[PDB]
Ligand binder design. Sequence first.
Ligand SMILES: *[C@@H]1O[C@H](CO)[C@@H](O)[C@H](O)[C@H]1NC(C)=O
Lengths: 98, 49
Amino acid sequence: DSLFSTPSALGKLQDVVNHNAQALNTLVKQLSSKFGAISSVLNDILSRLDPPEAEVQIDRLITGRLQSLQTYVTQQLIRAAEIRASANLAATKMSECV
Amino acid sequence: FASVYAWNRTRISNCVADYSVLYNFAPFFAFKCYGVSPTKLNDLCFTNV
Ligand SMILES: *[C@@H]1O[C@H](CO)[C@@H](O)[C@H](O)[C@H]1NC(C)=O
């Protein structure tokens, strides 16, 4: 009765799902940014500019997408350390409470 | 040709733009292209020119 009625009962497990699904949306929505280049599509840059000038625009995309990946991994390592803290607490309760 | 203060703009639409004809006037002092490389102009579609 207190779980089939109260909606925010499993709000700790659902919050874990939300944070990981929200970080992937931001990671894949950073592919639409330009970071200073003329376009966010590598095909457009490759099919509009000579190789001497295409590398200038492409390097703006790489350094911006590379920094978007590092932000995702670093905050994933930080968040995975909270989960392991709660996984060590649940393993302690499983062996001492149960 | 018109004066610089009354420059004449010509619409270009619904045609085939073979840019190889541009070099018939060979003595070009400057051919600076912005955004598009001058060699790839024959493989692109333009909304308005
Ligand atoms: C201006 O350009 C238009 C459109 O191409 C052309 O019909 C017209 O003759 C031009 N006028 C002058 C004064 O060059």
